Structure formats: structure tokens, C-alpha cells
Amino acid sequence: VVGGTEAQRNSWPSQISLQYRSGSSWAHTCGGTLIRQNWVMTAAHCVDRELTFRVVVGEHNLNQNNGTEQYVGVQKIVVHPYWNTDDVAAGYDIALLRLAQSVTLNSYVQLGVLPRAGTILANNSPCYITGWGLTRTNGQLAQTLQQAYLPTVDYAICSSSSYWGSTVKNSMVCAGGDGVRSGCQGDSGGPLHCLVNGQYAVHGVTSFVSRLGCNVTRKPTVFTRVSAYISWINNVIASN
Numbered sequence: 001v002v003g004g005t006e007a008q009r010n011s012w013p014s015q016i017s018l019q020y021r022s023g024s025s026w027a028h029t030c031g032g033t034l035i036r037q038n039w040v041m042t043a044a045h046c047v048d049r050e051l052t053f054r055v056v057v058g059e060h061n062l063n064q065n066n067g068t069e070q071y072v073g074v075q076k077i078v079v080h081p082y083w084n085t086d087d088v089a090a091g092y093d094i095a096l097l098r099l100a101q102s103v104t105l106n107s108y109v110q111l112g113v114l115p116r117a118g119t120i121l122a123n124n125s126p127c128y129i130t131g132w133g134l135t136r137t138n139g140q141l142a143q144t145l146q147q148a149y150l151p152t153v154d155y156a157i158c159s160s161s162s163y164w165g166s167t168v169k170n171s172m173v174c175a176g177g178d179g180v181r182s183g184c185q186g187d188s189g190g191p192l193h194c195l196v197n198g199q200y201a202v203h204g205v206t207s208f209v210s211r212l213g214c215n216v217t218r219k220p221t222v223f224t225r226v227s228a229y230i231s232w233i234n235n236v237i238a239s240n
């Protein structure tokens, strides 16, 4: 997250850290959202490579023991059938991970609230992006969970020539673009928390930013619109 601030520890309890094994150590690569005690929602491009993955819930500081963490392996990876790694702009950047074991829900680990199917947010709706991603374009990961206020930019505006153009589809959500705050590598797969009817619900899965950089004016961070995949998500978890 570029231009963010440290989140209160465990204040976004559904946020998870997706890590892969490199040699004898682990490395954070993406964010994700705990949607069931044994299911995590993340981006399809996060699990494109064939690596050994593990999920960490209740995490805050990636380099030290917070005394609230739970580590669990990934038993099954279900990528959306239409995902095309060579065309992130085509959408479908979403994947569900079945954990090897059910995590224990508590003060630091809770399920993320998903929007009702088809829900579209009005322009400039209040949302927050969270993650351990780069804090600057081509910079380095954050040690502690970061958050940044990132209001939405509706489809009409986001798909206009002044912004992303035809690169963005109606199956995506745009947020930010103020040139100061944005998501960045490492935030991918993470949530976009938006305030709806008094509660924060996960409306987006961090998907991509401009090749020019993370925080670029009029180039909002783009997210997979969760509400477009509710039926798919329910069908996977009910038959797996």
C-alpha cells in the first residue's frame, strides 16, 4: 500500500497473508480474505505458479511474533475457469483456496463479509485497502499491515478515456487514483473494504495497477468485483 498508515493490530481480522516456500524459508506474496473457517478468497494471478503455499491468519508484523498468528497449509486451489494469465484485463482474477485445516475464529481472526450478488457501489464510496505490499513503486514490502482510504471511481468514469479506458470491465471495481494512495505489488489478492449499511464488506480483490507505477493520477487501483462472483463462490464452497 502506497501512501498508507499502519492499521491498528488485528483491526481487519479477515485479512490473510499468502506466502510461498522458497528454499527453507517463507515469503509473503499476496493478500487474501478469510471467507469460511477453511476457505480463503484471493486473486487468481497469485496462485498461477506451482509453488507450495501457506496461509497466515491473525498476522500483523510479518517479521516478528505477534502472539496472534495461526499458520495453515493450502489443500486445494480453485481458480476461476475463465482466468487467462496472459490477459489480466479480461478479468476473472479470483481464486478460492481450501485450507488443510479449519482455523480458530477469535479476536484476531474473523470471516470477511461479502456483498449481495450484483451490488454496485455509487461513485466515491468510502473504502479502505489493506495489505503488506510495497509502500512505494519498486520499493519494498511493509513489515506491518498498512491501510489507506481509497474511495471508489464508478465504471462510467473509470472506463472513460481520461482514466483506464477499455482496459477496465464492468466486472471490476476501481478505487483511488489520487496519485498519492494506492495498492501495489504484494497487495494483490487482498481486500477492498467498503462501508455499506453500517458495516464493512469486502467488495474487491486487488488485481492490478498501471505499468507506469502503483500510485498514478487517474490510474486507480483495479479490483475484481466480488459481487459479480457470489454465485460462483457459493457453488464452489458448496461442492468442495
Ligand SMILES: [Ca+2]
Pocket (backbone or CB within 6 Å): 059, 060, 061, 062, 063, 064, 065, 066, 067, 069
Ligand atoms: Ca507476526
